From Swiss-Prot:
It comes from the Bacteria. This is Sulfite reductase [NADPH] flavoprotein alpha-component. The keyword Amino-acid biosynthesis applies. GO terms for biological process: cysteine biosynthetic process; hydrogen sulfide biosynthetic process; sulfate assimilation. It comes from Escherichia coli (strain K12). It catalyses: hydrogen sulfide + 3 NADP(+) + 3 H2O = sulfite + 3 NADPH + 4 H(+).
Length: 374
């Protein structure tokens, strides 16, 4: 019923309409609010879905790599059977911004780096090297000749990055919006960044071309049912889909109660989309909002601490049939929010541990505990 030309292979050639820094002038983060125009295409998506974004590497990063190897583009290389100049394969077809244990160990072996060979066969050193030294600086630090084919052989194909959608088409129309944290760091003074997030944030697009597709997520959806209470836990860039949810519930005039738990380092710099949350609260759509600012005062505070502190009202909402949503960092945040939810269930339901556990699992079976963590 909704088939669509357009997918990860065959993406829509869309364009960039807004690229706006959303963190204040003293934040440590660079977060962009992006809006991509979907023209005529009819690309459709629902709150909860994600936008797949094809990206190109930075041409100044390819150039730095090409030059440290003594090559230029000129060098023909084979990518999936077609013959291309090396700087095109590097800009469009291969990953340059993520280093791995495997790429280090292979590059070490291949070039016989005098300086990286001591890492070969040592997992912990390899992962540590990779986790701190991007490809381009591994080559700076270990000069060695590499043909263009041996260079391409070593790299991993480029793949699109997924960004939770931050808009509802009922509000925005033929537009998609996304909330991108831009990965930025430096090695000795050389500015480095995430391939896709820095592409969106700094390069291709000027107001300008982007290749996109929808990654549907039927396991991350508002209640069909405008009256069911929703609980939303999305710190940092995890707030995206919750901006999709609220655009939807405001446009549909759903009367259901909505609660947002949000968190980030500083109230005055990292309150993503702060004046929307104020208008939502003012219009009656956002019922409750709890905020955790980790760096504003000494003791570190996170959304899990706020869940714990609102346990009793959380338990009352859960008992009113609330849906619970978690979005954001899978590594520590998802796990710490889970435990806090288990502790709220145990303490305000009457149960302790295994029963709290069965209770959350029943909520998930049942589709009242949905997560999009990454
Ligand atoms: C379903 C889903 C939804 C998502 N939603 C969002 C979203 O709403 N917003 C969002 O921002 N992201 C989201 N992401 C994550 C996003 O897809 C990306 O993985 C993220 O944008 C990073 O991609 P990148 O291309 O910019 O960087 P990459 O190029 O993939 O790289 C990150 C890296 O930089 C290096 N690195 C970083 N810092 C340093 C340092 N100091 N020292 C040396 N090495 C370092 C690399 O080795 C690795 O660490 C989502 C992911 C998924 C799967
Ligand atoms: O940088 P989301 O960032 O950098 O926000 C945590 C917020 C974080 N954070 C990391 N662990 C988290 C957790 N367990 N729950 C929620 N947010 C988490 C923080 O950085 P901090 O450690 O900045 O201060 C900070 O508020």
């Amino acid at each position: 019923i909704h088939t669509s030309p357009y997918s990860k292979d065959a993406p829509l050639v869309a364009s960039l309409s807004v690229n706006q820094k959303i963190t204040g002038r003293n934040s440590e983060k660079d977060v962009r609010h992006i809006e991509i125009d979907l023209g005529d295409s009819g690309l459709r998506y629902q709150p909860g879905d994600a936008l797949g974004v094809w990206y190109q590497n930075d041409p100044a990063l390819v150039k730095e790599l090409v030059e440290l190897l003594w090559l230029k583009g000129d060098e023909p290389v084979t990518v999936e059977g077609k013959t291309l100049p090396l700087n095109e394969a590097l800009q469009w077809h291969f990953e340059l911004t993520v280093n791995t244990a495997n790429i280090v160990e292979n590059y070490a072996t291949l070039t016989r780096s005098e300086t990286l060979l001591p890492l070969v066969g040592d997992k912990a050193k390899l992962q540590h090297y990779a986790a701190t030294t991007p490809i381009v600086d591994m080559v700076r630090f270990s000069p060695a000749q590499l043909d263009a084919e041996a260079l391409i052989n070593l790299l991993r194909p480029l793949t699109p990055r997924l960004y939770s959608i931050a808009s509802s088409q009922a509000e925005v129309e033929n537009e998609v919006h996304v909330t991108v944290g831009v990965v930025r760091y430096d090695v000795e003074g050389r500015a480095r960044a995430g391939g896709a997030s820095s592409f969106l944030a700094d390069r291709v697009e000027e107001e300008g071309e982007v290749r996109v597709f929808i990654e549907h997520n039927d396991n991350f959806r508002l209640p069909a049912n405008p009256e069911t209470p929703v609980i939303m836990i999305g710190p940092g860039t995890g707030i995206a889909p919750f901006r999709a949810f609220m655009q939807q519930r405001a446009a549909d005039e759903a009367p259901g109660k909505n609660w947002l738990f949000f968190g980030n380092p500083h109230f005055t710099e990292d309150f993503l989309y702060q004046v929307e949350w104020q208008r939502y609260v003012k219009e009656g759509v956002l019922t409750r909002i709890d905020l955790a600012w980790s760096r504003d005062q000494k003791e570190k505070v996170y959304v899990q601490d706020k869940l714990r502190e609102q346990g009793a009202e959380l338990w009352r909402w859960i008992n009113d049939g609330a849906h619970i949503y978690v979005c954001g960092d899978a590594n520590r945040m998802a796990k710490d929010v889970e435990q806090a939810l288990l502790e709220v269930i145990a303490e305000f339901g009457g149960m302790d541990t295994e029963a709290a556990d069965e209770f959350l699992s029943e909520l998930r079976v049942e589709r009242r505990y949905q997560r999009d963590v990454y």
